Symmetry: C5
Subunit: 320 residues, 5 copies
């Protein structure tokens, strides 16, 4: 077991056992204190932050009886989102994105989940995630999350993550609006660089979102220990979302793909205006400077010089 | 919790049309409770709720017609692919309804949900304004066969009305394309590029919706639960075929439009090339001439100056 | 009302009906404008080709419809002319919709007419918008008892007509191939204002064609790979002949689409490098006669004229490195 | 009538027939122009390769057709030369259509000829448009009892011929790969009118080529994965060899299509660049010798020549920032 | 039937056997084909690595002796060919490519490697000395991993994994070029940059050409399995199958990104050329009327007029430039 990622900063474990009447929650750095929740009779959400600790992963792995190859996949962070179904657990891999604005580049963290009897095991690389609103609802017995079991937990978390993609997409939609100005209105050096960067990002994004969709398709259209004619519709809700997201990313890809073509046309057009001026200037003040300079007959030349400046300017009434 | 994600909050109205073979009533209210009883009408009723920002009214009709909460969420979320969902006791359909503002070249959508149910079609709009007047006419003036037939045929009639509207929309877009495909090779200018891009943008949003629309009606054509069988289905096929036609026509536009900047860029490159030729004839005569006129810090020079102005112009007989 | 029959097209000129009943021994032909005179052929025991030109006459369509027992929705489809080619199979008739094209050369634009067919027992009902079609060679063969058309029945008729129509697409494609050859010159050997307009017009046209030709192929695929009252052991191979044609046609339209898609890029390249030649002359001219006019102007003698001549020659034999 | 046999091609040139009957122990070879002299080989007990050059002779085709009992529609397909490569399987014969290409180098244009084959008991009927083909190496191997071609029967003959044809495509592809290397030089070195013309012609050719090669692959897929009178776990692997080849060929043609699709974009960028260098010179020249010629012309001494020299140097060390 | 080497590599010839088992290992290099042939019937895994297939004779000999269909021999000696897997009664036949990216002369060369899995042997045929399998040699040499405990199919796996792992390192090299170039294309606008861009696309084509079939190969070995000991070695083959998918994805990602570059470059350049035009046109548009009125004259009121309509220009190139 080797951690291929780059996050070694953090380590923490954060359990949230809850039931309809009363809820528990704590943090530890002692793996052994969580393990017993494997056999809790009520939902528990064991959130392991810091998988660089390959040892902790191996321990939880063994104790929850999780195939080694699945453990390898958890610690490998260069990897398509995916679902794997086993007899006694579902294994899910997702990415969690961050758009750094201002420096126009997009960073990802991998999150694995395992659904299992009465637990959701979750493995992060690093402190920071998108699941706080789920924490709130459990904390403040809101929605119905407390009434329902562990599969609905899994749903709630995935929904939280997918909902985050919408926020991410809004940030990207904004860049596109900005750039769609620049490209035809703020014509500029950073604009091309930025246009390309944006396409690059939309590729990496599309790279992840199509698999995400595939994941939730499987959870919607298969379903083993996630209670059937029961929570599936909620999983469909999210499946539908990913579809919407996928569509939206394609929409952006198209739009963005055009921009340079716009820019190129905007620039060819400006260059053409520039040529007209240079050519009017040159096409009046070169014969004029020429006849002024054969002398090397006064208001008769100034009259001739003024008159064939006027037969030009009212000939650049036909064009310009 | 039910939250309206849209942007339309000024209107609210409800408009019922109960009808049967013999008699025909209709009214408007803003009191939800006055329509609810039509749930159990033995004859077709078309309950049209305009103004879903009123999440309360939706929740009420939802509960009373026994409609899963998740379907209510979907009704109030307006950023969403057209789609069909089949349930034991109702069909749930989501469609978009478009508007092309010509001359300022931008395209707005409104979401319309439908629910088919025993003897009712529940319909939810965002705002006053729709495309269903011709259906109102036929019920009003007992025209066609709409009165003789039941509620599924109502559903058909409404969807058909909506789809038929897309054809009108497409005609409007076809017009812009004719206009632009002039401008792009006629007038060399900044707004023509802006417009071209705007058009592509629009055709994307349009295509975004039209493929799912097609998927919707495919489902209604090829599935059918309480849509009375070897009965109404062919009418739903009519519309399913329409969407296919529409889908085709949108692709046709996408292609054609995708070329335009390339046309424009070519149109502009060769205007700019004409401009260069003038500047270069002017320069290539009046620069050696102004040069020899200037080595002087008489009619043999004016003769030499006139003769190699003529060896140029009859050398720009080979080119220009 | 979407049950009332309404003609969405734009052709209201003509109306005519033209029957060709034929059999192995004898052949019976006429024109009428009285629908009722054709209806009895519904039950003819020999092939009959009833050709109704002028569907703006929604009434005649409705009559023939009722009498041959044809679902109203199929009637609606007949009168709607903005529509993919398609085949619909019913218990007692096949319904087919095709387009029929015309390329106006020299004004580089191409127009379509919709023709519907219905195969049925011993009849082919056919509905056109307007006088003018592509079926004359079928008329000849029936007229002059040629080929085998007379020996065979009504499905073979249907085949014969569709084959006639598809064969017309090849002619159309030759016309278009010609435009392409012309443009492919202009675009790199007459670089000019009408050439871009024309290039675009051609792409447009190839789109509309491609729009229709893929469906056409879908149609004949269905007739080839399904077959109800198309006699089995019999006519199918002939339908496959045409199915294969449509494939060839489809392929040919793609080939044109590709080729044509490049042309502006060629033109744009052709133009970029003309504009580059123009710059070189302007820049040689400027780059000799500006220092020279400058030195000539410092002054407000044959050592200067010698210096002016010599660094005109170090330029021209430096535009031996480039130009 | 589309039962009448008509030759749609453009080769009326030639007519010849060339039989090669062979067996383990001896071989025959002769030419005739009398169809009737070959027909008996239908019932030869040893492989015979009957090669009919000149299908404009629709009569000869009809005769061999009837005598070998070959469905008329198959005969129509033989005489139609505008057509996807394809296989058709019948009870007593396999029918195959292929194209045969020629790259004229140096005038950079590509001609095709259609070859049909029919495998049948102990015969391979072959139909060409015109004298000239790619099958000589098969002739040699039969002639000089080489390989195993003499030991094996008629399906292996079919294989040998198709393999000869496919192997020709590789040679053709090498010729095209060469053009690509040449052009990908010109395109970024030789700023010129013929390079664009050539680039386009190359794309055109790769389209026509791709047009044919995907179907070719489909053909040999069918022969590999179906197999009626092709003796079974016997000849099939040889047909797989060729099937695999066509896959390689298909890939290679896509590879070329891509690469070539970029070239104008390269050229356009190469040219935009050159034109930009030209502008820089014209603009440094103009941006020095225009203020200088201007102040030299105010007049209408070494303090001016010093000022004229110094702001020629604040320019040139300002075109240190750009240039 | 006749065996002809279509390739370009005639430099080398060598044979290199590695017989190994759980306890003992043997290893030698030979120029005499006949010294390896007996290992056909070794009871323990043997990795017979024949470098230099231009020696069509040696191939024919090993072919006959291991009983290998002639058409498979033809395929071995033909080096212009998709990766592929062929299954036979008593051997699996695999063809792969093996790449090298020469940096700084931005060109990458391929070599074909065919493999044959067979009872207790992996026959391997290279064109030329040089390969990517050294780490497999180490693990056998220094009884590392599990490779000694396991049989010949796991050997096959180990070699293919070594090759596929090499594609990742190749991709990293290519990812670097992309970063460099996406620099040049919008910073250092220039003649070599276009050449390089094109060469990169070319390379990504050739790579994509190979990587999709590679994926297909390992899909086949993952999904059906004859003498690959089944619920045994298969997951390891799945590991590699998954890799090829990851690689395929990464090549697509590069193809997209790179496909834009000339368009970037072309836009970068059009712009620069437009800036150049602006200076030429400001220069020309002040110093041509000025030089003109200075030249009507074949004093400080003129120099004042000449200075003032130089300033109404420059503060008119304050709307624009
Ligand atoms: Mg003077
Ligand atoms: Mg309607
Ligand atoms: Mg382009
Ligand atoms: Mg990187």
């Amino acid at each position: 077991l080797v951690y291929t990622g780059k996050y070694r900063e953090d380590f923490e474990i954060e359990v949230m056992n809850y039931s309809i009447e009363e809820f528990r929650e704590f943090k530890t750095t002692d793996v052994e204190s969580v393990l017993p929740f494997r056999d809790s009779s009520t939902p528990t959400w064991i959130n392991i932050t810091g998988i660089h600790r390959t040892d902790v992963v191996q321990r939880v792995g063994e104790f929850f009886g999780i195939h080694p190859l699945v453990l390898e996949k958890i610690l490998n962070v260069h990897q398509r989102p995916k679902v794997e179904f086993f007899e006694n657990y579902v294994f899910i891999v997702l990415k969690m994105f961050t758009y750094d604005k201002n420096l126009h580049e997009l960073e990802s963290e991998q999150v694995s989940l395992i659904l299992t009897k009465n637990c959701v095991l979750m493995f992060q690389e690093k402190i920071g995630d998108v699941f706080d609103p789920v924490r709130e609802r459990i904390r403040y017995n809101r929605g119905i999350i407390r009434k329902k079991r562990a599969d609905y937990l899994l749903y709630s978390l995935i929904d939280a993550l997918v909902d985050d993609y919408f926020v991410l997409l809004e940030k990207i939609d904004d860049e596109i609006d900005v750039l769609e100005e620049e490209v035809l209105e703020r014509p500029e050096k950073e604009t091309v660089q930025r246009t390309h960067q944006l396409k690059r990002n939309l590729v990496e994004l599309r790279k992840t979102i199509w698999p995400l969709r595939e994941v939730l398709s499987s959870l919607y259209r298969d379903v083993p220990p996630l209670i059937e004619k029961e929570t599936v519709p909620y999983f469909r809700k999210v499946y539908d979302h990913t579809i919407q997201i996928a569509d939206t990313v394609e929409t952006f890809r198209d739009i963005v793909s055009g921009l340079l073509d716009v820019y190129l046309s905007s620039v060819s057009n400006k260059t053409n205006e520039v040529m007209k001026v240079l050519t009017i200037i040159a096409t009046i003040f070169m014969p004029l400077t020429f006849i002024a300079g054969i002398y090397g007959g006064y208001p008769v030349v100034l009259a001739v010089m003024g008159v064939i400046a006027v037969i030009m300017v009212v000939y650049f009434k036909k064009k310009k």
